[PDB]
Amino acid sequence: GEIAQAIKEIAKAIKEVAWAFKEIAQAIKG
Amino acid sequence: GEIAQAIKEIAKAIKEVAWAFKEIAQAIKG
Amino acid sequence: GEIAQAIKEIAKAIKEVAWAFKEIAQAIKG
Amino acid sequence: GEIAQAIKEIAKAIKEVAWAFKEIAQAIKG
Amino acid sequence: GEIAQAIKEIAKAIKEVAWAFKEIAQAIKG
Amino acid sequence: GEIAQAIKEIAKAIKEVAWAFKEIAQAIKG
Amino acid sequence: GEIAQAIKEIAKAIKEVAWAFKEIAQAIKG
Amino acid sequence: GEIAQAIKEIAKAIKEVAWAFKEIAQAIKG
Amino acid sequence: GEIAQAIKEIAKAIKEVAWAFKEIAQAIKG
Amino acid sequence: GEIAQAIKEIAKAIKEVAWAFKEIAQAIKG
Amino acid sequence: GEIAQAIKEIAKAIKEVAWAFKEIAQAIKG
Amino acid sequence: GEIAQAIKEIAKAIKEVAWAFKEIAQAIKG
Amino acid sequence: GEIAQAIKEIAKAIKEVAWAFKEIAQAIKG
Amino acid sequence: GEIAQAIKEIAKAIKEVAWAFKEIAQAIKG
Amino acid sequence: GEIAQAIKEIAKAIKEVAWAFKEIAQAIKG
Amino acid sequence: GEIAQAIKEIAKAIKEVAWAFKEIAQAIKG
């Protein structure tokens, strides 16, 4: 579905945001 | 349904955001 | 409902995020 | 309705996010 | 509307989050 | 419509979140 | 569309939030 | 569709949020 | 709700259609 | 919910349409 | 809203269907 | 689901309408 | 709106159906 | 999904309406 | 969009219903 | 899409109904 695929793109973008926060955790620990 | 499955994918991505913030908290605590 | 339950899963994930921010508040105070 | 009730649950979860950020602000102020 | 009012509750919660970030700005400046 | 008006209210609230983050950036710069 | 335009306003607000985070990155580097 | 296109715009904006957080992580690492 | 009231207007119109069919039943019997 | 209640009102109106058609069938049979 | 206005247009069209069926009933009665 | 069950009630009402048309077919044949 | 315009097309088609029933009323009277 | 399954149930009911009208046509032809 | 395109398909089908009723009116007139 | 395909199934069923009305026009003319 068109709308379902677009909603899945938001989840993929939020996963990108979660990965960036893991880098900040690596930055604080470093 | 694909719509509810896509909405569930956003919730799973937000959970990964919560996991990365817990890694940040441990990085500040250490 | 299928869609309603999926939306509730997002709220549960946001609650997880709020709990992680409370750990960061505990980390800054510590 | 279950849909509007589920949407209300997201708003309640975001309010808890605002509460945790106020705890962070007090942690920086102290 | 039921759904419209629930969506407005999310906006009110996000406004609460924005106010909490203003406290963090006051905390960093202090 | 009330639905689109409610969605517009979320966008206005997110804009206030962006404003508070700009206040944080100025607090770090000062 | 009325609803589509309101959803686009949320994306524009999130882009504003992303720009504010870039200022915080400039603040930390400075 | 304009609705799915608008939802895609939110995902693109969240991706820019992830990019700005990666810039923050590099600012802490440097 | 705006949308709910408009949907109720369709049901009222269908009830008008059902009443017209009752007149046709009266016309055939007469 | 008001939306599902409004959709239920359409189903009730269509049932009245079925009742009027049964009155027509009895008018032809008599 | 344009959506509720469009739904209202369907109800108005169904009302015209009820009007034409009342004209049929008068045609059988005469 | 609340909305899904209400939509199923419309299908059940349309099935009632189809059964009434079968009576009219029995009335014409009789 | 794309969806609103498509819904309006259904109302226009129902108006066409109502006009055809007026011809049947003219046919029975003739 | 339950929503699409419910919409499919309406289409199945409308098909039964078409079947009953074909029985009417055979009743007029005989 | 596929949703609005599907809604347009219903309007096209209802137009064919209006065409068949005009054929009925000509069958009664002849 | 799941929902779009289900909506298209309704249009196909309405086309079946329009074809049945053409048989009734053939029945009246015959």
Author numbering:
A (entry chain A), B (entry chain B), C (entry chain A), D (entry chain B), E (entry chain A), F (entry chain B), ...: 102 to 131
Quote the study on this structure:
To address this, here we describe the design, characterization, and application of small-molecule:peptide ternary complexes in aqueous solution. This uses α-helical barrel (αHB) peptide assemblies, which comprise 5 or more α helices arranged around central channels. The αHBs present interesting de novo scaffolds because of their stability, controllable oligomeric states and lumen sizes, robustness to mutation, and the potential to functionalize the internal channels for small-molecule binding and catalysis by incorporating both proteinogenic and noncanonical amino acids. We have demonstrated the ability of the lumens of de novo designed α-helical barrel assemblies (αHBs) to bind and organize two ligands in conformations that accelerate the time scales for two different photoinduced chemical processes.
For simplicity, henceforth we refer to the three αHB peptides CC-Type2-[SgLaId], CC-Type2-[IaVd] and CC-Type2-[IaId]–I17V-I21F, as the hexamer, heptamer and octamer, respectively. Finally, we used analytical ultracentrifugation to confirm that the oligomeric states of the barrels with bound ligand matched those observed by crystallography. Using ultrafast spectroscopy, we demonstrate that the channels of heptameric and octameric peptide assemblies are long enough to encapsulate both dyes simultaneously, and wide enough to juxtapose them for efficient energy transfer on picosecond time scales. Analysis of these data yielded FRET time constants of 0.98 ± 0.2 ns for the heptamer and 1.3 ± 0.2 ns for the octamer. Using the Förster equation (eq S6), the internuclear distance between DPH and Nile red was estimated as 3.3–3.9 nm for the heptamer, and 3.1–3.9 nm for the octamer. These are well within the length of the hydrophobic channels at ∼4.6 nm and demonstrate successful encapsulation of both DPH and Nile red within the same barrel. Analysis of the data returned fast energy transfer time constants between DPH and Nile red: 10.4 ± 2.4 ps in the heptamer, and 7.9 ± 5.7 ps in the octamer, reconciling the high energy transfer efficiency determined from steady state emission measurements. For the octamer, we observed a broad global minimum at 4.1 Å and a shallower minimum around 20 Å. We also tested the octamer in this reaction, although docking predicted that its channel should be too wide for precise anthracene π-stacking. Consistent with this, while the octamer did promote the conversion, the loss of anthracene fluorescence signal was linear, slower than with the heptamer, and similar to the controls.
